[PDB]
C-alpha cells in the first residue's frame, strides 16, 4: 500500500478499457462491412435481372476485402428456400441441401437456408442448411424478423471447433414494403448474409500480443441472461476486477469485459 495501490488500480482500468475499445472497434468495423455485403448481394443478385453475382465473383470479392472484416474467419450467403422450391433449387445448383451435423441429405423441412455463396475460408459451408444448427437457425429468424444485424450466443464453430459468435444480416426482395411488419419481412426475405467471429483464435491474436498481457486475466462474457453469464473469451474460472463496457451492436445481447490482476 497505498499510493502504489491507487496507481495499480489506475493501470488496470486503463489496460482494460483500451482492450475493450480495441475489441468493440474491430467488431464494429466487421459488422459494418458485413452490412455492405448484404447490400451487395441484394443489389447484384436480386435487383439485377438476371443475377450478376455468382460463387466465383463472391469468392473473389470477399477474399480481396478480407482485410475489411478483421475478426471474421469468413462470410457466406445462405438463400431462403421453401420446401416446394427444393427440387427446382437442387436441380439448378446441381447439389442436395445437407445437414450441418453430418453433411447428410436434409430431411424434409418447411424451409431451409442453404449456403450458395461462400468465402473460400468457409468453403465447407456450401450446400449446408444453416437452419440445421440451432444457434444459426435462431439467428436467421431474428435477422429476418428485425431487419437488423443479430448475434448468437457463444458456441463452437464448424470445422475448427473454435468458440465464436455468428453475425447475420437479412437480405430482402424489392417487394419488401416501406415500414414493413414482421409478417411482411418474413414474406419478403431472400436470404441471410452471415459471418463467423472466431473469438477463440482472432480475439486471442488481437489481445494476447499486447504489452502487459502476462500481468492480467481478461474475460469477455455474454451477459444477456444476467443469472447465466456465458464465456465468450477467456478461461472458465468463477478480488480487484474492473468491468469495461462492450457494445457489439445487437440489442438482444449484452456483453462485458472483465480484467483482473494475477496476484
Ligand X SMILES: C/C(=C\CNc1ncnc2[nH]cnc12)CO
Which residue lies nearer to its own copies by CB, 29 or 258? 29
Cell 491507487 sits on residue = 6
- Beta-bridge mates of residue 122: none
Residue 60, contacted partner among ligand X, its own copies, none, CB below 5-8 A by kind = its own copies
Residue 150 CB, nearest approach to its own copies (Å): 19
Among 42, 127, 168, 244, binds ligand X (CB under 6 A): 168
Task: Compute the least distance from the CB of residue 55 to its own copies, in Å.
Answer: 12
Residue 40 binds what, of ligand X, its own copies, none (CB under 5 to 8 Å, by partner type)? its own copies
192 binds ligand X (CB under 6 A): yes
Q: Is 36 in the site for its own copies (CB under 8 A)?
A: yes
User: Which of 123, 120, 139 has the alpha carbon at shortest distance from 131?
Assistant: 139
Assigned C-alpha cell, 106: 436434409
* DSSP string for residues in 198-259: EIIIIIHHHHHTSTTGGGEEEEEEE-SSTTS-EEEES------EEEEEE--S-TT--EEEEE
Q: Does 53 bind its own copies (CB under 8 A)?
A: yes
CA–CA separation, 213 and 255 (whole Å): 21
Please select the residue that binds ligand X; options are 40, 58, 133, 142, rule is CB under 6 A.
133
Task: Tell me the closest approach of the beta carbon of residue 75 to its own copies, in angstroms.
Answer: 13
Please answer whether residues 147 and 247 qualify as being in contact, where contact means their C-beta atoms are separated by less than 8 angstroms.
Answer: no
Site map (CB under 6 A) of ligand X, residues 195-214, x = contact: -x------------------
Does the annotation place 158 within a ligand binding site?
yes
Establish if 139 lies at the interface with ligand X (CB under 6 A): yes
CA 222, 24, 120, 88 torsion-angle sign = positive
149 contacts ligand X (rule: CB under 6 A):
no
Helix axes 3-41, 55-64, angle to 10 degrees: 150
Give 254: exposed, middle or buried? Use CB within 10 Å, 0-12, 13-18, 19+. Answer: middle
Q: Which residues are annotated as a binding site?
A: 136, 158, 168
Q: Which residues here bind its own copies, judged by CB under 8 A?
A: 29, 32-33, 35-36, 39-40, 42-44, 47-48, 52-53, 57, 60-61, 64-65, 68
Amino acid at each position: 500500500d497505498d499510493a502504489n495501490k491507487i496507481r495499480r488500480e489506475e493501470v488496470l482500468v486503463s489496460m482494460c478499457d483500451q482492450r475493450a475499445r480495441m475489441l468493440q472497434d474491430q467488431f464494429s468495423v466487421s459488422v459494418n462491412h458485413v452490412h455492405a455485403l448484404a447490400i451487395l448481394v441484394s443489389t447484384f443478385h436480386y435487383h439485377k435481372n438476371p443475377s450478376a453475382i455468382d460463387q466465383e465473383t463472391f469468392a473473389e470479392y470477399t477474399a480481396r476485402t478480407a482485410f475489411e472484416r478483421p475478426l471474421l474467419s469468413g462470410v457466406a450467403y445462405a438463400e431462403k428456400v421453401v420446401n416446394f422450391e427444393r427440387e427446382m433449387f437442387e436441380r439448378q445448383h446441381n447439389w442436395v441441401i445437407k445437414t450441418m451435423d453430418r453433411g447428410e441429405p436434409s430431411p424434409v423441412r418447411d424451409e431451409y437456408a442453404p449456403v450458395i455463396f461462400s468465402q473460400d475460408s468457409v468453403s465447407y459451408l456450401e450446400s449446408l442448411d444453416m437452419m440445421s444448427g440451432e444457434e444459426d437457425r435462431e439467428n436467421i429468424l431474428r435477422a429476418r424478423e428485425t431487419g437488423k444485424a443479430v448475434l448468437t450466443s457463444p458456441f463452437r464453430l464448424l470445422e475448427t471447433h473454435h468458440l465464436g459468435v455468428v453475425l447475420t444480416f437479412p437480405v430482402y426482395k424489392s417487394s419488401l414494403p416501406e415500414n414493413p411488419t414482421v409478417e411482411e419481412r418474413i414474406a419478403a426475405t431472400a436470404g441471410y448474409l452471415g459471418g463467423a467471429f472466431d473469438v477463440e483464435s482472432l480475439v486471442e491474436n488481437l489481445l494476447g500480443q499486447l504489452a502487459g498481457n502476462q500481468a492480467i486475466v481478461v474475460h469477455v462474457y455474454d451477459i444477456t441472461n444476467a443469472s447465466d453469464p456465458l464465456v465468450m473469451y477467456g478461461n472458465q474460472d468463477e478480488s480487484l476486477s474492473h468491468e469495461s463496457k462492450l457494445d457489439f451492436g445487437d440489442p438482444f445481447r449484452k456483453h462485458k469485459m472483465i480484467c483482473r490482476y494475477h496476484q
